[PDB]
């Protein structure tokens, strides 16, 4: 069993400013002699770390080399800048007569530079749409390398699958871009819902990045209408009320028509919100019942849409 130089990672990715960990282990403790780190092969190679002699402010050992028994010669190089890219070799020396002679080299680890993607930007449709229609959202992120990236779409907690994604370019680039379009169906319960784009990349290390769009901005929930009469249990009065149910957004004009004529009369009307995020608008008034068949119309204009109405006979 002769000493071997183990370097698990053929290529190591790192990002500007971060620390790089170069992994190296030995299989045997003999022959006796130091282990050194170099960038490059041949006589022109650069000395990166030396156990005993030399000053290496940027290098820091993973384990305690001073311990007789240590077999791990992995090093951390801090504050990586683009000048640090290269192939780093782990090299064992044995004793000689005056000099030490090279005994065995690891196969080297390439230190390569990657880049984090940008915070994903999710854009919604420009105009609002009623429920039971599918709309499109887009997600983009850019500036990342390498090209391998993962993009997930969610509506609230549920992952969507009705999407297309492209990564660009195909060739070599300093930076790649990811673009995705998701088809999302609008349900009547969707006012409080969020569309999410999740970007996963090796340079992020566990923590993905998220772009969001609120569906509150994409949906119009048309209101439902009804008008009623209530005989005031004590007296010759009628309680006429108009019920504008489950609408979104909160932008509404409600007019009363008496035989097709606008009233202008005083009405006590209140606004309520529903758990589903939609709104309700109640509008009631009392009539002194004179004597002289009146058709009452409750006319509602929601969010700039065509007027809808309901008739009621007294």
């Amino acid at each position, epitope marked *: *069993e002769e000493l*071997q*130089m*183990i*370097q*698990p*990672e*053929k*290529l*190591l*990715l790192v990002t500007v400013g971060k620390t790089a*960990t170069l*992994h190296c*282990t*030995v*299989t*045997s403790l003999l022959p006796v002699g130091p282990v050194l780190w170099f960038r490059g092969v041949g006589p022109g190679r650069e000395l990166i770390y030396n156990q005993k002699e030399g000053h290496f402010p940027r290098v820091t050992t*993973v*384990s305690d080399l001073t311990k007789r*028994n*240590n*077999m*791990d010669f*992995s090093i951390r190089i801090s504050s990586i800048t683009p000048a640090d890219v290269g192939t780093y070799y782990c090299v064992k020396f044995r004793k000689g007569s005056p000099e030490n002679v090279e005994f065995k080299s*690891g*196969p080297g680890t390439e230190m390569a530079l990657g880049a984090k993607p940008s915070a994903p930007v999710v854009l919604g449709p420009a105009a609002r749409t009623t429920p039971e229609h599918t709309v499109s959202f887009t997600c983009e992120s850019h500036g990342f390398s*390498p*090209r*391998d990236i*993962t993009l997930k779409w969610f509506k609230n907690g549920n992952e969507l699958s009705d999407f297309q994604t492209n990564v660009d370019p195909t060739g070599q680039s300093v930076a790649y871009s990811i673009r995705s379009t998701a088809r999302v169906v609008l349900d009547p319960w969707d006012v409080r819902s969020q569309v999410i784009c999740e970007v996963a990349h*090796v340079t992020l*290390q*566990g923590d993905p990045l998220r772009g969001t769009a609120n569906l509150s901005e994409a949906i119009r929930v048309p209101p439902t209408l009804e008008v009623t009469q209530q005989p005031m249990r004590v007296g010759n009065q009628v309680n006429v009320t108009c019920q504008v149910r489950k609408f979104y957004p909160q932008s509404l004009q409600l007019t009363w028509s008496e035989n097709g004529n606008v009233c202008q009369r005083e009405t006590a009307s209140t606004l309520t919100e529903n758990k589903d995020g939609t709104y309700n608008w109640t509008s009631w008034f009392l009539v002194n019942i004179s004597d002289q068949d009146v058709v009452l119309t409750c006319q509602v204009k929601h969010d700039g849409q065509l007027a809808v109405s309901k008739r009621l006979a007294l």
Partner: antibody
Amino acid sequence: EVKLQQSGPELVKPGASVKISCKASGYSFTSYYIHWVKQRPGQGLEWIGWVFPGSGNTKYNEKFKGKATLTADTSSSTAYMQLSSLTSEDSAVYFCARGNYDRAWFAYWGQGTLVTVSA
Amino acid sequence: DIVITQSPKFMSTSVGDRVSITCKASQDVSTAVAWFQQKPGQSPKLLIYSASYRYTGVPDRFTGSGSGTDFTFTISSVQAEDLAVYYCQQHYSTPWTFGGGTKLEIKR
């Protein structure tokens, strides 16, 4: 000969933790990388991470960030993997493998340990 | 995370036929590829490493080749014990990643 014998099958409550073990023999234990690998029943393989015993240096697949913790007891020639806050996504066979040649390739494998996460 | 896509997912073959599984990486992974064999009930077995080298006592009939983004695993003469799932793996960059498997079945 080079042997890796892992501990028996596990049944763990959702949300609980467990510690599989992998006892090594017939080689100098401090000297080689140990890797763990995951296999979800009838699915593929996934590298979880490594530990170099002797240094205790570990490196993880970020997918298993706060899920797995690798350790080694050199005196007992044994390697451990702890799995925290188990969901049904963790139900799988887990293997330990020992590295070989200059890249620590997955060359010597344990028999696997079935972990079932259920109530 | 490098993706390895492996073809075909299923293959059926007579005893003594020649077969070839291909494996494609999303990056240039040099020759840092391994091939494993997993028979039902068992752990994976290292067959090929560094894309073409046979491992301690693996039969003559198992060969590997390829460099860069394309790799080939080949059985020269399929034997009945050779039914299993075969995986390629990149051993180039962390996190190390495996292909999806090729299930080999025997025509008889």
